[PDB]
Design a protein around this ligand. Structure first.
Ligand SMILES: Cc1cc2nc3c(=O)[nH]c(=O)nc-3n(C[C@H](O)[C@H](O)[C@H](O)COP(=O)(O)O)c2cc1C
Ligand SMILES: Cc1cc2nc3c(=O)[nH]c(=O)nc-3n(C[C@H](O)[C@H](O)[C@H](O)COP(=O)(O)O)c2cc1C
Ligand SMILES: [Cl-]
Ligand SMILES: [Cl-]
Ligand SMILES: [Cl-]
Lengths: 136, 136
């Protein structure tokens, strides 16, 4: 019914790409980020907290996927999207990332959790083909 | 307020280690498992669904961690535990895995989500040191 602190501790440490964001604060900013997340994105820790993950997007990013994400966030749905993200140095990578809407015993969204997965160009091609085939 | 099907689709496919279990069914069995999960554990798909993840544990698995997990499950808490797990061939590996309690708009636990991470022996040593230092 709550959050065991083991979750929060192993999150900041896990060599994979995890993030947690707080909807209670404005703009839903990152409160905890994994070490593998900083390895993948290349950012320092001070450039992560207090900000929303929009800084991973850029020019060549599919805005339909971004609208999908923001709709699922406004409704608090658990989703997953593959899109092109940018590191700090400007390099690009295909991020297939998940979003979970953790809710308390009252049904209210307490925190958002995000798992990012770097996928190859073949997986990106197939999943983008499906997502673009999802036309209305 | 619901589960976007993108979550379920990208779960079964993601090359990482994800699982989802249904508390509505007896013993809380696995309903969806990732491809990377089958790569890590070595099991076929038919040996996964309809079963609880106890088949990953074994002889030299810390039972205190298992009691911790089952208490957090009975209370529906989001946790994370590092423990020794076994593959199908009998080989061992240190699994630092997370557990999230997805709840609906009414606060009831709908499904459990689990992310497994294979960690080295140094990380296992440090985290097991902390968890054993957690004595009452
Ligand atoms: C927990 C969480 C993790 C997210 N991770 C990413 C990410 O890794 N890459 C990305 O492009 N967007 C990510 N997003 C989405 C953005 O943070 C943002 O919500 C998205 O751009 C839609 O919001 P907007 O329409 O206001 O721009 C994540 C969102 C959440 C809640
Ligand atoms: C979603 C989910 C994923 C789990 N993944 C693992 C796992 O990877 N390895 C493991 O040893 N136990 C895992 N467990 C815990 C076991 O499934 C089981 O709940 C645990 O042994 C405690 O239950 P018990 O006291 O009845 O044995 C997971 C549990 C859940 C709910
Ligand atoms: Cl379905
Ligand atoms: Cl091994
Ligand atoms: Cl090692």
């Amino acid at each position: 019914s709550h959050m065991d602190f083991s979750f929060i501790k192993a999150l900041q440490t896990a060599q994979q790409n995890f993030v947690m964001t707080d909807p209670s604060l404005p703009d839903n900013p990152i409160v905890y980020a994994s070490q593998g997340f900083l390895n993948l994105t290349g950012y320092s820790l001070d450039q992560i907290l207090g900000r929303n993950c929009r800084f991973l997007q850029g020019p060549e990013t599919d805005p339909k996927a971004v609208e999908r994400i923001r709709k699922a966030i406004e409704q608090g749905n658990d989703m997953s999207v593959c899109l092109l993200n940018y590191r700090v140095d400007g390099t690009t990578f295909w991020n297939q990332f998940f979003i979970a809407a953790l809710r308390d015993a009252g049904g209210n969204v307490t925190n958002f959790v995000g798992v990012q997965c770097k996928v190859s160009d073949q997986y990106a091609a197939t999943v983008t083909k499906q997502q673009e085939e999802e036309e209305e």
